[PDB]
Design a protein around this nucleic acid. Sequence first.
RNA 1: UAUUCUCAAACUUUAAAUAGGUAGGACGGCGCGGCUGCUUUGUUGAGCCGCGCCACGGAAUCAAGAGCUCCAAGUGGGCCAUUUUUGGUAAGCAGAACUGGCGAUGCGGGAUGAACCGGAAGCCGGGUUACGGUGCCAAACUGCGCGCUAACCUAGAUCCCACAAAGGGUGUUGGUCGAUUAAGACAGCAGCUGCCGAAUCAACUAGCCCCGAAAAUGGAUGGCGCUUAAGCGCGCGACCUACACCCGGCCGUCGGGGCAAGUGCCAGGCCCCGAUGAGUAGGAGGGCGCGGCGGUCGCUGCAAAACCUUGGGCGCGAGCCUGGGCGGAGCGGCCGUCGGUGCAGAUCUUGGUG
Lengths: 163, 177, 44, 48, 48, 46
Amino acid sequence: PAGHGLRSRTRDSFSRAFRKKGTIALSTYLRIFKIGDYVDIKVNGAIHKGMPHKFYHGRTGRVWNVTKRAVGVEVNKQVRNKILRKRIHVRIEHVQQSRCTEEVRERIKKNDQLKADAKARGEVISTKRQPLGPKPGFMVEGATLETVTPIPYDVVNDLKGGY
Amino acid sequence: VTYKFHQYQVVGRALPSENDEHPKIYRMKLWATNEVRAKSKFWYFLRKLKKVKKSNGQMLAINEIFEKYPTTIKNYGIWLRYQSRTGYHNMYKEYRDTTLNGAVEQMYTEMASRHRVRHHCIQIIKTATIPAKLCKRESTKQFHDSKIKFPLVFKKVRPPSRKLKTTYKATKPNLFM
Amino acid sequence: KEKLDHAITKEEASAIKGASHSWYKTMISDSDYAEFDNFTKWLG
Amino acid sequence: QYAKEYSEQEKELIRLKREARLKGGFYVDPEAKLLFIIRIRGINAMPP
Amino acid sequence: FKEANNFLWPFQLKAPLGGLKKKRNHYVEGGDAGNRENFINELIRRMN
Amino acid sequence: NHTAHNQSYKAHRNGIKKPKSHRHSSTKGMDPKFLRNQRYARKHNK
RNA sequence: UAUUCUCAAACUUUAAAUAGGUAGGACGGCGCGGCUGCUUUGUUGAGCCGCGCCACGGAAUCAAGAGCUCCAAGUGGGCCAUUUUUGGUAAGCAGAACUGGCGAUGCGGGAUGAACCGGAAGCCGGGUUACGGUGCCAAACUGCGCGCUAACCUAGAUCCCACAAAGGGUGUUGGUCGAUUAAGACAGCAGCUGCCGAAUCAACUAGCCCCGAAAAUGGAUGGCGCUUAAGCGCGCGACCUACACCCGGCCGUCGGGGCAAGUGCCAGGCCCCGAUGAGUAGGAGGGCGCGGCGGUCGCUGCAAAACCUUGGGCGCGAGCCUGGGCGGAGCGGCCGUCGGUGCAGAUCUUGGUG
Ligand SMILES: [K+]
Ligand SMILES: [K+]
Ligand SMILES: [K+]
Ligand SMILES: [K+]
Ligand SMILES: [K+]
Ligand SMILES: [K+]
Ligand SMILES: [Mg+2]
Ligand SMILES: [Mg+2]
Ligand SMILES: [Mg+2]
Ligand SMILES: [Mg+2]
Ligand SMILES: [Mg+2]
Ligand SMILES: [Mg+2]
Ligand SMILES: [Mg+2]
Ligand SMILES: [Mg+2]
Ligand SMILES: [Mg+2]
Ligand SMILES: [Mg+2]
Ligand SMILES: [Mg+2]
Ligand SMILES: [Mg+2]
Ligand SMILES: [Mg+2]
Ligand SMILES: [Mg+2]
Ligand SMILES: [Mg+2]
Ligand SMILES: [Mg+2]
Ligand SMILES: [Mg+2]
Ligand SMILES: [Mg+2]
Ligand SMILES: [Mg+2]
Ligand SMILES: [Mg+2]
Ligand SMILES: [Mg+2]
Ligand SMILES: [Mg+2]
Ligand SMILES: [Mg+2]
Ligand SMILES: [Mg+2]
Ligand SMILES: [Mg+2]
Ligand SMILES: [Mg+2]
Ligand SMILES: [Mg+2]
Ligand SMILES: [Mg+2]
Ligand SMILES: [Mg+2]
């Protein structure tokens, strides 16, 4: 509306990948979606029903409802000075289960056991991750040294493969 | 005692990896005003010549090279590559100095004067101490004379210090060669 | 003022001097400039 | 105790560098753990 | 370190005694910006 | 005619404001069949 | 059929940089039970509920704190710049994208300038700098070094920026490639050749300079001038220079703390500690001033009001207090309350006067 249709500017976004057209593999229809799961919205161009607006393509949201053929997804949308919680329904052909939280569950268990193993011995520790820190000092065994020097200029070589 | 430009050997390598646990070690002889700038120019060449960026490289050693005999006079040849306003060129220059640091300082000063080439547009390819009989430039040959003799045609008239400076004097300077 | 007069073994001192001297030789070592076949004459 | 530790670290680094030199290898110094940062530009025309 | 460093109020240094070279260029180019490694100490003397 | 100049600056004066997140979210718009059964389940809960 | 030159905003297999979304716990996890009309062949699932147990805070950095609501002003002509970018030969032209800037904002530099560089500001002392500078104008070197340039065209002289091109020079300075030469080159001289006895020839390249280069008031590296530059390129040391930074004083604002068997206080006060200060349109607070009214405390013929003054003092300020003079009959402070309550402008009104 107001100068732009629903699918305006979707020539590339909503087109199928090269040599990946035709029948949709059935693993898409065997996925299980639960409330609270995170899903990435990826519009399939072949399915014209229950397809989200182009804005939600490439966005990750949280599942808040499950129907026969579609899942309700909560997606953040920035409008001026506010973030809106947009609730949309999308057919499962356009959603992929996201691996954004794949490390959380396995990390909690490791932290829980590490704290438990430390509680029994009365040693207070921290399970927090840390970013890459500075490396310690070390010795490197001597080896043959290859000398690098600037190369004399040659005009004939100022072209891919030369002139 | 003090030089504008210092010579350094910089040694570095690519970070060890599972495929290459002992990557090749590269060394360069670079000229810079201090160690920090010597390291930066070392990674410039390794990035563009060996495809090893500093982000995936390792600095091993950096040592400053000092003239062996800073009291004698040597002839220094410098092979360099520089960028003009229209392209790149190669040239060979000769200098006479007590240390190669002074000869390199002369080279940068000359390139700025005769070619308007700034420091960052010059790459030093090679340096060497040339024996007198193998020099090529006449500006260096004419001083290879056991009986070198000439007067001071141009003198600078001035008091030893500004303490003896006066605006007015009773007589003009008396100068003779 | 009184002109009052070693912490390394004599053999150790000789090894230290040799190692440092050898390291200095590598510091001033130059490339052979053999990979620049088109500029052999110019590079000398 | 702290004063003694500072002197030992300074001499420890010197010994390791000399040890690597004697064996013909290299000793990579530990990467700096601490930085001091100074602001050198004013507060005018700041990108967000 | 986090608590000890945050406990310190940011240091209010003075204008450097002797001035700067060029704040608009990187220290590698002969300016004053960026990492100058151990040479930050030389600047700390003139600004403290 | 049109321009977005200064609009991001205006938005960031008091924004970007994220909505308040509560432990329990509204059930409006969810499957009525699921909601109706849930209401009965709570009714007979003991 | 196998090759080949060159291409695409409305072509594309492939495919960046930058930017975009989500997640990194106490709203977590596990165990045992329960509810249902939904779901399953199935207490099978789904969600929820109860009880018990565990949960060192589950990347970094910061956090002058976070959330919520009400009422309302002004605004809805914009402009400039780096970069991306459309129309146009182009425009100090027109139109978009991200950010900053001006507008609303002084201050130092750019001679001069809304936007360029630096940098944002209470009132001061000291110190040090930013950009920019150190021959005079003009605070700081005719400082210490190397080279280049010589302009008989007004040589040249600093981001934006106030212009210059193709093409040329046996001007001069560097460099690159090649050729020739003590077995004698080159020029001249001599009859391919002899004398000749030391360097010579050719092309290319790029610094400065010169040609190319024509406009109307007399004129503009800002001016004067400058050539062992005071020009150009690159250095070194010192020095000069902001309302910027640092230390100190004082004012305001904001935040924090102390003060009762009260020797106890305009507590609406006193004292102590920390940070901080730009402002048009606009909002609000605390104050100043004018004329009444209800009260209260006073002044005045031993001189009220008004007015005059090169008298003096207080307050950041609106203003206030007071000396002297003139004048000759009224006037003021304080609390509350009220209003036809504050002028430099309106081709403002009336009167007066240059
Ligand atoms: K269109
Ligand atoms: K409006
Ligand atoms: K020329
Ligand atoms: K009264
Ligand atoms: K008076
Ligand atoms: K009143
Ligand atoms: Mg309409
Ligand atoms: Mg629109
Ligand atoms: Mg249909
Ligand atoms: Mg700026
Ligand atoms: Mg401060
Ligand atoms: Mg000083
Ligand atoms: Mg400066
Ligand atoms: Mg800038
Ligand atoms: Mg209007
Ligand atoms: Mg408009
Ligand atoms: Mg217009
Ligand atoms: Mg306006
Ligand atoms: Mg100007
Ligand atoms: Mg001052
Ligand atoms: Mg001079
Ligand atoms: Mg030309
Ligand atoms: Mg001037
Ligand atoms: Mg102060
Ligand atoms: Mg203010
Ligand atoms: Mg009154
Ligand atoms: Mg008067
Ligand atoms: Mg009064
Ligand atoms: Mg009235
Ligand atoms: Mg009125
Ligand atoms: Mg008037
Ligand atoms: Mg007015
Ligand atoms: Mg009038
Ligand atoms: Mg009139
Ligand atoms: Mg008249």
